[PDB]
């Protein structure tokens, strides 16, 4: 029951900083070294740093050299990485991965915490209808920041033929997404269709009714 749990992620402005954290479990932790690997959107994996398993060696990749500093405290089962003067190349998903009993072997990984670098201010979504004329209909969840938002149809009761798409980042720095559902054209003037949008980052809830 090896568990690596990342914490700390969040939103920040360019030139700002965050302190990440990785808590270990189900294994004796000073013993192995620790890695940070990040995954930007529409991208692969790139390694960033590792801290030996005792406290002494710390490697970094060229790119966060200067900007990032790593550390640990085995008596607590954490480890932490302070990231400063953050840029939007830094934006992505950060995983802490354990090192093999320097192995250079990430043998167990965490799920990751998300880092967002934007000068955009928080904002709740404007929810627009994608009206039908089998039929297709949906909701346009527009101009929200930051990620994420969840969408339901009829409070959980419409689950089939539902496609909720990955959001897209516009120039405004606001996100935009689509949620559609395919239904019978005979149900249109009979059945009610409501998309439930939840954007927790802004404490915002919207229900949008979509009709013909």
């Amino acid at each position: 029951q090896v568990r690596l749990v990342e914490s700390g992620g969040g939103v920040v402005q360019p030139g700002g900083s965050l302190r990440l954290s990785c808590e270990g479990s189900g294994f004796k932790f000073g013993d192995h070294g620790i890695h940070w690997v990040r995954q930007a959107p529409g991208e692969g994996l790139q390694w960033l740093t590792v801290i030996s398993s005792d406290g002494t060696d710390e490697r970094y990749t060229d790119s966060v050299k200067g900007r990032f500093t790593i550390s640990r405290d085995n008596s607590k089962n954490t480890m932490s990485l302070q990231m400063n003067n953050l840029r939007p190349e830094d934006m992505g998903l950060y995983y802490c991965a354990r090192d093999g009993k320097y192995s250079g072997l990430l043998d167990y990984w965490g799920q990751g915490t998300m880092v967002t670098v934007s000068s955009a201010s928080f904002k709740g979504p404007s929810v627009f209808p994608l009206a039908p004329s089998t039929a297709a209909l949906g909701c346009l969840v527009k101009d929200y920041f930051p990620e994420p938002v969840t969408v339901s149809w009829n409070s959980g009761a419409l689950t089939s033929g539902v496609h909720t798409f990955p959001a897209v980042l516009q120039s405004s720095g606001l996100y935009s997404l689509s949620s559609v559902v395919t239904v019978p054209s005979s149900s249109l003037g009979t059945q009610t269709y409501i998309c439930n949008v939840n954007h927790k980052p802004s404490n915002t809830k919207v229900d949008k009714k979509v009709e013909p």
């Binding site: 890695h35 692969g44 994996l45 790139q46 390694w47 590792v50 490697r59 970094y60 990749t61 060229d62 995983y95 991965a97 093999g100 192995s103 250079g104 072997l105 990430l106 043998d107 167990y108 990984w109 965490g110 799920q111 990751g112 404007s126 627009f128 209808p129 994608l130 009206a131 089998t134 297709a136 949906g138 346009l140 527009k142 496609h163 909720t164 798409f165 990955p166 959001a167 897209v168 516009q170 935009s176 997404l177 689509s178 559609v180 395919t182």
Partner: protein
């Protein structure tokens, strides 16, 4: 600095079939090389390290072979749980620890042509001064599709954004969403809004349109 190049970029295969993934290093890392499995929303998973050896819990359908410069990952009898993304990672010369750009193992299915839908902007949105036109491509295979927006016969470029869902757990289909965004002033001086879709399940392009009004 070592550079891993993976091929193919995407591999489309059926379960029961053999999958063969390659990882070329720019310079002998020799034995030294791991393979990882990655499913969306999940944590990467170590499959085999030191090139040929599976870690514990990893099935026999998985074998690594190779040396120094050229490596192969064979998943010899595909289960649905393997369609994931595979990455190779080197550790002879680091930092930095390098990775390939991954190979995506996707499911081969029969060609399914997209059902296309076009959606005009709501009146509500138009009051805020912007207009979003949306074109939906529903459950098609394969993934490669082409959306071309046209406004009053003029081909649009640079004013659209797109999104594709993950392959369906049930269908093995993909759906795509395209949003054409324009000012309200522009939306109102034009008439014909069309969405042209090009896909291998069509003998020719499908066009859904609407006239403002």
């Amino acid at each position: 600095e070592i550079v891993l190049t993976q091929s193919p970029a995407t591999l489309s295969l059926s379960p029961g079939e053999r999958a063969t993934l390659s990882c070329r290093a720019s310079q002998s890392v020799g034995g030294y090389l791991t393979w990882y499995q990655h499913k969306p929303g999940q944590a990467p998973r170590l499959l085999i390290f030191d090139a040929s050896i599976r870690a514990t819990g990893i099935p026999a359908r998985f074998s690594g072979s190779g040396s120094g410069t050229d490596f192969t990952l064979t998943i010899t009898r595909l289960e649905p749980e393997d369609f994931a993304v595979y990455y190779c990672q080197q550790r002879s010369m680091w930092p930095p620890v390098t990775f390939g750009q991954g190979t995506k193992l996707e499911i081969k299915r029969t060609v399914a042509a997209p059902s296309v839908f076009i959606f005009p902007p709501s009146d509500e949105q138009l009051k805020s001064g912007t207009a979003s036109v949306v074109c939906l491509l529903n459950n098609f295979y394969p993934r490669e599709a082409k959306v071309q927006w046209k406004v009053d016969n003029a081909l649009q470029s640079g004013n659209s954004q797109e999104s594709v869902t993950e392959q369906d757990s049930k269908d093995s289909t993909y759906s795509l969403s395209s949003t054409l965004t324009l000012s309200k002033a522009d939306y109102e001086k034009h008439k014909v809004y069309a969405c042209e879709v090009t896909h291998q399940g069509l003998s020719s392009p499908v066009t859904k349109s609407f006239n403002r009004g």
